[PDB]
Amino acid sequence: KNSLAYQRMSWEALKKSINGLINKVNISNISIIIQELLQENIVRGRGLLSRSVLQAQSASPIFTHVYAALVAIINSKFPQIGELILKRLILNFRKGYRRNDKQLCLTASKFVAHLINQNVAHEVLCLEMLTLLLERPTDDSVEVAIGFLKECGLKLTQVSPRGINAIFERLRNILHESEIDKRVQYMIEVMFAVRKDGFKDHPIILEGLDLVEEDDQFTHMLPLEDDYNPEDVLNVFKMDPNFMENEEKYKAIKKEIL
């Protein structure tokens, strides 16, 4: 009926607008595109919003930073959405890894490293990722750890240098005491280069990717081997009997959060 047709038109047009904004989010418009993704209720379709976020982090290895600053902007207020994004990236990383999918594992590790640098993903989960990649390091898994580290070596080494020491020692052992080739040799060499350079070629977050205050953010820890769930079925809409009440709630919350 009229309420159902209104809900369907809302779902459709809002989803199209939110997808356009997620692919439109820039660095010179991170705050502006964040306020535009907020002006429409990003929480009504939080499943589909985090799905657009995951798509941005996956399909573009070069815009994972923008999706990351957006995830931080949206999680420092609503940690549940960025939390779903973290669960989805954990699912995608475990999928790429467990199924030997180089590209998907690499993209999901890109999103997770961007999260660990944006201070939305904890150090124990990054430790678990680096350890599972370096458990039986081959060219592929060691290089995956190397790509993760080329971006997230600042967060782990500045928050908990124990991670840096463990990473360096384990790398030295598994790449100097096992039948590893010039591939893993040069991956370890790139690792040592990034380390000794003091992480100047890749900071935690470039200008515009981390602007939230010290404790005014949200760093939730959902693990890799913990039985997380994607909860992305919400990317398909659903009828709402209380669309009016919940809509007033979301609109007033958007007013109180801007």
Added chain:
Amino acid sequence: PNVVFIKTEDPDLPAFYFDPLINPISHRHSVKSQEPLPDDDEEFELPEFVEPFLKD
């Protein structure tokens, strides 16, 4: 020979401790080598008197 003595900052961390100042070994080479390594599964055993020379 230029002496390389690394002044510490705090008394907290252990004495022997890899310092950030030192350059990471990250020694890399070819498939490194294999040894005249006398593999086990033949025999060898330590008489349960001897130990790391002083582990107390």
